[PDB]
């Protein structure tokens, strides 16, 4: 009658991504664990761009767009920062934001590549992922014109905009051999063996399971460079716990009002 | 500015002797002479000291403890004669 | 989990049945001592107060118990008025038991509400009613406040005086009422009023019950209010003399004992005189025992000097007569407590006429010994222990009578029936620890006692066996004869536990008779199961054998000295290998290993020095003369190649001396014996250094006279005495030989060699802390900076600051303060630049005092360099007297340093 004992284990880890397996857990909880990675993993990304003077061939709004999508290293300072719309202060304060500056004046004959390395930050903890490999391109500049802007970056999360989404790609699956027979193959010969399959060469089709439920879910989360994958997963779980706690508190108050 | 309020009992020449000492966390001790006007005299040999002590320092990551104590000088050297108290201080760095 | 655990009990408190409600209520002290957080404590007590206010009159009893159990946690309540209102709201309930419970609870809350006038009033009201079960609780609460408040006690004392002197209230309650008058110590006027009340109360109720209660209560009062003790003592003495009630006399004794134990000096002369007269008059043995116990307690303290203070012969003094008569009185207990006073007076006060009393005492001692020899009763052994303690005190205080007492004790060794023998042997060993002639000549008789052990007892052969081993080793100064093999066989044929043989081996090694140690440990080696003990035993065997080999030294023969030293070092090295192997994460033998390793270092220094001085004749003069003209030698005054080696070895010896300093200031745990031993070794090292420096190097520069008190017989062990003798010999030689010859070291080599031989002559003594460790203390010191899971360095913007929050807790395994009690912790923090004054700009210290067991300290570190940094924190505990006592884990943390690119560009442009 109680939630089963979830059991997990990692296959291998790397800066690029993390691959792991979950055992003794339900499909719905696994799916929610996935969804939280895509949606509810807050990070720091540029969100307020003020342009003193723009003269390149990319119109200003395009530059604001591109600066929006650059990734920033937010290993732990994300916890310290507190949402902008929620922080009570004058406009932006060092607690609820971070400041970036970008001034470039191409004066040489050759075209200059205005690139992310030129974005001067205020706090060393956060910088474009490329800094700390080729640079992320912003806009090319001909001799003569200039680009001067000041940006403020804040803490958001997936729902608000996809520039806050750090999970480059999540591969979620289970029953690599359709044992549960959720899916049906009219010609199971044609389909390719899943890399996680354990079937023989001839069979290539697990037997039907009269009694069973999805188990041993497989996860492969690839970071976009904003956060280490392990930190991503931990933050996902912690934020989901926070949400559940909020729901419990509100509904307890509702029950007390009811009675 | 930290308001400092104290009661001094049975002291001769309080105004020329008593001095407020502030020990910062980092091991530096600053001596502060209160003004001759800071010493009220409600009753016989029982003075009150009211003053401001000015604290300052660069930015700290977290709150710290600044110790405030009352010293007695002589004519050369000093004697603590009071219980040190702790005050929480937090200098944040400049804003925009 | 701290918040969750509370609501889990909350729902229980909300359960319907008093079963679950009681289970919840009595479950809190667990949660408190699990989570001492003040927020949780306050939240808990609010619900406890509410369930007390609305309860089933048994939940109230449970809550009363909870309050009486978790009293230390009460002070840390932020919200007091609400809680006290809840508790006090059930004092108006008409139920005479619900009033009694609440009065008890208030009494249990004097600590946090000691000035509440409404509580004071309610208690003073309930104190005069008709319901026994509430009056007997109001009495308790009144006694509780009368200690933590004054303006309540002033009113109470008057109330109680009236309410005693009114014929109301039964005698049973009048008994409970009087003790409140203990806590009238707040003011002198309170004490005077209470005493005036007593003088009438005792005469107005001359019962036995009331007298027994009142006299004790007000002797406690006199102890507390230290202004009328002279008055209290004379009243007690009058009641001792006059009242015939045996019980009242016995209370008088058991009360005068407390007063003589707390404040002995105030006792005047006539007080002691009258007490002695009363002790003489009584015909009753038990009362005489009581008075003599009181007198024995007084004698040890300063009171005796005042009593024998002049401005009547001491023989005219009655105290002497009582002492003498009781020294021979029939009863064993009376005789023991008599000899006590005699010994104390003889040791402390030294008058011309008292010398005959020395003979009187010493002769009474053997009478006591023979009387207690064979009784074999618990009281008999108690008296015997007291007698032997008196013997030890007499001997050590006065060396004159040591020879007298020792021979007697030896003669009783024959007649002791194997029960008192252990005690007597302990006494003898303690005595012999001072003077050697007390052990040197009595070799055979002790072994005659030893040989008959196997047959004269079977129940506790082991303890007397080990004791006899200790005494025989102490007596044997140089080595062991056939007596040795006789001991070996005695053990073999007689029942001999492995543990026992180990203890005899330990004592042998401790007293220096290393010859027996190697033999015994060899027998041990083929024993034990775990490898750790085998390695430890083997290491100890090798050490003992090396010491034995060293002992075979010949006076003034440099040839054999080098070979013997080399051989003994060839063995210590195996020993160190084995010992280092014996270590484990548990009990890593730090002191044992380090002390012995530095011992090998010492002996190597000695070998190098002896080789150098011998090489003095190794064509040394040839070098200096050939290099430069001998006259006005540039290399040195009569320069020689050996000058460089003499500088080298002098430096090495000083360094070794300081390494003993490191060991000593690192132990902090051993008793006062091992510390003196280590200091002694450091003294030897520094002695050789001073000798070589003041005799070979510039002697005129030193030109220091050994003008200090020397040779005072204050040493605590024969080993120390012998070392002090050797030091004095070396100094008296070197002072004479300072200027006689030129630095060319004609005979100076002879003096150095003789000093080395002397220093090696006294074999060694592995001290207690080496074997068996007591008073285990440690500092956990888990600093809590920005935590760093791996060794990955931590970041700081470089422009602002860093704060550490070094947290430390001190943990005691054994008796917390057996010898030294921690008084302060001198945390010293330093930083260094990892990649490279090496950047010690941030090097500071704070002396935090641990208030209960826990001390936190905020440390601020400033630094503005790119590279990583190492942060070192050193504990340096400090004890009562004030000493460095360097200890502490000495943990390190790595910290990274980075700068904002904003400032980076600013600096670049500038
Ligand atoms: Zn803000």
From Swiss-Prot, chain B:
Component of the Integrator complex, composed of core subunits INTS1, INTS2, INTS3, INTS4, INTS5, INTS6, INTS7, INTS8, INTS9/RC74, INTS10, INTS11/CPSF3L, INTS12, INTS13, INTS14 and INTS15. The core complex associates with protein phosphatase 2A subunits PPP2CA and PPP2R1A, to form the Integrator-PP2A (INTAC) complex. INTS4 is part of the RNA endonuclease subcomplex, composed of INTS4, INTS9, INTS11 and inositol hexakisphosphate (InsP6). Interacts with BRAT1; interaction is required for the assembly of the RNA endonuclease subcomplex. This is Integrator complex subunit 4. It comes from the Eukaryota. It is found in: Nucleus; Cytoplasm. Belongs to the Integrator subunit 4 family. Component of the integrator complex, a multiprotein complex that terminates RNA polymerase II (Pol II) transcription in the promoter-proximal region of genes.
From Swiss-Prot, chain C:
Transmembrane segments: none annotated. GO terms for biological process: cellular response to ionizing radiation; DNA damage checkpoint signaling; regulation of transcription elongation by RNA polymerase II; RNA polymerase II transcription initiation surveillance; snRNA 3'-end processing; snRNA processing. Its main location: nucleus. It comes from the Eukaryota. The modification Phosphoserine is found at residues 313, 784. It is found in: Nucleus; Chromosome; Cytoplasm. PANTHER family: C1ORF73 PROTEIN, INTEGRATOR COMPLEX SUBUNIT 7. Belongs to the Integrator subunit 7 family. Component of the Integrator complex, composed of core subunits INTS1, INTS2, INTS3, INTS4, INTS5, INTS6, INTS7, INTS8, INTS9/RC74, INTS10, INTS11/CPSF3L, INTS12, INTS13, INTS14 and INTS15. The core complex associates with protein phosphatase 2A subunits PPP2CA and PPP2R1A, to form the Integrator-PP2A (INTAC) complex. Interacts with NABP2. Component of the integrator complex, a multiprotein complex that terminates RNA polymerase II (Pol II) transcription in the promoter-proximal region of genes. This is Integrator complex subunit 7. It comes from Homo sapiens.
